[PDB]
Fold Uric acid degradation bifunctional protein.
Amino acid sequence: VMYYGKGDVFAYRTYLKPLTGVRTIPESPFSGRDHILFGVNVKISVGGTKLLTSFTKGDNSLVVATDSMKNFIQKHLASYTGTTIEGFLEYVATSFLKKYSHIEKISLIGEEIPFETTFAVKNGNRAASELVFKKSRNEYATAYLNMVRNEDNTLNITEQQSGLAGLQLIKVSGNSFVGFIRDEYTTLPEDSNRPLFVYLNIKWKYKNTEDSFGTNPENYVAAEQIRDIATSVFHETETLSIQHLIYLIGRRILERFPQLQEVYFESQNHTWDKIVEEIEGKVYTEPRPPYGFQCFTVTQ
Amino acid sequence: VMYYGKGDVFAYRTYLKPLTGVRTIPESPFSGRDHILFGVNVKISVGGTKLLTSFTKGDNSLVVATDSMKNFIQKHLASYTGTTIEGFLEYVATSFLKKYSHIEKISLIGEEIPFETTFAVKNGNRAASELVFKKSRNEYATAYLNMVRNEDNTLNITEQQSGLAGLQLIKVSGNSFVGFIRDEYTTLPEDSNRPLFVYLNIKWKYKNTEDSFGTNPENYVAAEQIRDIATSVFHETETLSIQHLIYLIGRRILERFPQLQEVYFESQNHTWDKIVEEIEGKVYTEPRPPYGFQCFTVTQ
Amino acid sequence: VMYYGKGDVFAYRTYLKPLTGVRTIPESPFSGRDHILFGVNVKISVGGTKLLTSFTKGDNSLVVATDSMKNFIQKHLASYTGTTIEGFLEYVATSFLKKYSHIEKISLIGEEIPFETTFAVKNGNRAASELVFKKSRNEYATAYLNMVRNEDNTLNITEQQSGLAGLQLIKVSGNSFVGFIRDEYTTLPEDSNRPLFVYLNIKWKYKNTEDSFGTNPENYVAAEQIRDIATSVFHETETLSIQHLIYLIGRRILERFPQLQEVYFESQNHTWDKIKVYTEPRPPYGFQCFTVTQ
Amino acid sequence: VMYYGKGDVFAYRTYLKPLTGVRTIPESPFSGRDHILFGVNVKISVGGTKLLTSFTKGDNSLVVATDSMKNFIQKHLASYTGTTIEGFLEYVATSFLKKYSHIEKISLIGEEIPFETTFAVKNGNRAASELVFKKSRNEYATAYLNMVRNEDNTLNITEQQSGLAGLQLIKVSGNSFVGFIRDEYTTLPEDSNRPLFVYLNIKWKYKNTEDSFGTNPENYVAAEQIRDIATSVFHETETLSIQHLIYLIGRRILERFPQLQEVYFESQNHTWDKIKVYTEPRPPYGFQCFTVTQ
Ligand SMILES: O=c1[nH]c(=O)c2nn[nH]c2[nH]1
Ligand SMILES: O=c1[nH]c(=O)c2nn[nH]c2[nH]1
Ligand SMILES: O=c1[nH]c(=O)c2nn[nH]c2[nH]1
Ligand SMILES: O=c1[nH]c(=O)c2nn[nH]c2[nH]1
Ligand SMILES: [K+]
Ligand SMILES: [K+]
């Protein structure tokens, strides 16, 4: 392996081109993004056989400084005319490989920095502010893009993924976990009504990469819509495990978005413990640190 | 000094008594709390001259185990019949001092664990879920209560404060910081239009402690309403500094809530830097770690 | 209340004047600091009645920008000729009030950024490097200073404290917690041999503020020495509670350092649960606050 | 993909069998581990075709609860008779696949929880305590193991790696970064003497998996020794980049440990900005990934 790059390249700008013309689904009122305030955190990693002597000899002749990669990313947000985080990564990647022809591969991760609308009273009228936004530390959209320059000097995307990260959902009732193996290592009691608390990271892969860029926005799959499917499916279903929940969420995603090839889940179990004192309302509290987790792919 | 206690006592319960009958203000649509899902993180600290030998001699005869304080808090959330985090602390404090008459002082901090409504589709109807909630890592309500047992064995509250913590607001334009001292230590340029990013922690003190408990809920001041004043005032005003912004927020709070005696601000400045590369849309990025801060009290 | 300032002002300096000639105590090998690499994280807060209109009117005419406070701190680490973090805060505070006559009060917190030595081979000899250091995220020295300008324009120290923060100590045996109140709320079993795991913040106040500056280094009390007293006392004693442990640590500190007026403790209990094998507990943690005076 | 498991399974054990008889190298004093106190944080992941219906139908009949995996790990630390974190993972993996025939693959990550010795006075003599240890939040040993059940029911190790994580090293001088591309996007000045601050994660693979278990301790490679090689090489060399530094560290590791097949580096650049006085940079950090093979 031989890669180098820059992480935590934050970039914020106002008045990105709005995302509109999206295709709606029953589970979500999402209708687009006004993009008055946009933020992204980018990680860039590059490689190429011509970088060998920067490691073996200390020869920096062909090294793009990682500080310069930071400048490159931030400058390209200023000139980006598109509407999605996926399209921004494609713009950066194509531009970078065209600039530096000795680079054979670039990998980009983009994580949206989400902001929420606030309201203000102007002359007796309370209405959405175009100026003041709340920074959110909750869920956010993500994107991943890898691109190569082939031996014949043509350029190709080699992996593209979109995602939703940081979603934390608790369902207070309507969840069971029963019927699991009870042997000499089992101290977990059967529970026909637990308050299941799941962390969800969800990623999806398009059949056609062009659909990820917003160029024809009716074919875009928004992380907001995926989020809203997840919350609806969790509500609708008596869950039998996190495994079965994420299967059902994935099936619903692929049914709603036939342009997707597959969907990938990383879930964690953070369910609260019943308190020690006997019960009045039932009371729960934080568990010990060990957390369950699941990784699962659903394909068309 | 001589105190001991328990921190990070989390307690979650469903169907706390709803908060309704609140008094509205122009800046906020807040109309109450449904309390289907309630969470709080409590810190308890106690003291008393009779605890001396637990330090000086290792005699635990009069020590309430901190684990037992945790049990006490969690059990009392199960039996609490009120509607506010302030009233919950009062219930815990009065009950604890009545149980343990050798304790002379108790200090409680409560931090709400906020949850946000989600939506689900049931038989074609998309509507607020009573089951699935999103855990929020954004702003949250707080409460502080100190109570003593006097030498004559009567009980009194000795300090009570309510608050809002973790509010992060960015205003993209309509902020200036000019006219400050320019001397041999000054490298900051004058800026007539900066994207001011402030962290706000806001605390308030009632004239009459009973108004904090929800018993007559029209006299309650909700952290939600304080939040909404802060966002409105930030929008309405060309800011001249964070100092002047928090003064104006405080004045508006005290005007809207004449039952409050004073309001206290802890603010931090986290404003982004303009990027190094020249500009296309202007682009900003994260600053170096040093952050400005302000502490300020406004009184009636 | 009316204060403003800057937090997280980091400053890293090479070749500060070495701290030497400190009095060594039996609990600790500490005998000074080479100061090849010295880092500090400073928080500055200032106030004064003449700042009122910066809040009430948006008038910045008397505002020292917090960014300029950051520059002031960093520049003064470059010019500081002393040997201790306490002396550095004194230098910053005096310098700042002398520079800005409208400031009536300044409060400073300094946290040392600790570095540890590393091994290098030089001509076959393994020894501590003079060039390569390891950044530590464990315990660290602290200092606190509040200074005011009086109406007669004299400057006065109103608060001064030194400290050790972030010390995490576990003793595998020789600890009990028994005899506490058992009632309707008690589920904790009595335990005659627990692996007590304590977090310790320890603060001390000098009888004579001059002793904190290193001017006469025989009178300086190093956070390293306080750490080593804490571990020695923890080892020596069959503990009966965290309360009684911190009492005994504090008594030893005051006995070893008669120039100290008081010691202050903030402890937390992070003892593992028994499943011998132990594991991490649930989040609630016990804590204690306690002062011993000379 | 179809896996599930448990993360953050902490387990703390006293008096593990000591690691002794290790081969010492010139860069490091390391000569074993007393193992009075031993902590590990384990992540377990398992899979198998027979788990399909636990996802597709909600049938838990073949689900080992992740809580039970936690119990399994913790109990096996109590019964483990070996001397290394790599050997502990092997014991857990073999034991788990032998217990649960429907599991076809298991992946384990183990992170050592590092403790440091402390000073105590015993009858006037200051010495390392056998009872009181300091919890360290600095660098730590790691191990990784993947094991599968074949169709003929043999068990096979498919991946195995050891590591050192969280090493943070700053070298005050003797580092350059010059000669890189300067174009429209370059604002970074050339620097002939920077205080290079690197974070290092270092991983290695043995030629013979048996060497990782400590069974023959002369062949074990301790994370402590890798750390000390890293600091020695950093010291010895006028660095020309992080890229070239990690190349030289890796070459020295493979020379000192011919039983190793490869070394892998994940480095990050956290060098301070110059305001001599330096300060913390803005958040963006450089990083490098690089493998050296024997
Ligand atoms: O949903 C769950 N899946 C699991 O595998 C599991 N194991 N313990 N609890 C659990 N809950
Ligand atoms: O609003 C501000 N107040 C201040 O005191 C300050 N100092 N630098 N920038 C600043 N901005
Ligand atoms: O040392 C202790 N002090 C306490 O107050 C306490 N309470 N529970 N466990 C405890 N341990
Ligand atoms: O060691 C370095 N390698 C790099 O690639 C680099 N880029 N900017 N600074 C750097 N330093
Ligand atoms: K719309
Ligand atoms: K209502």
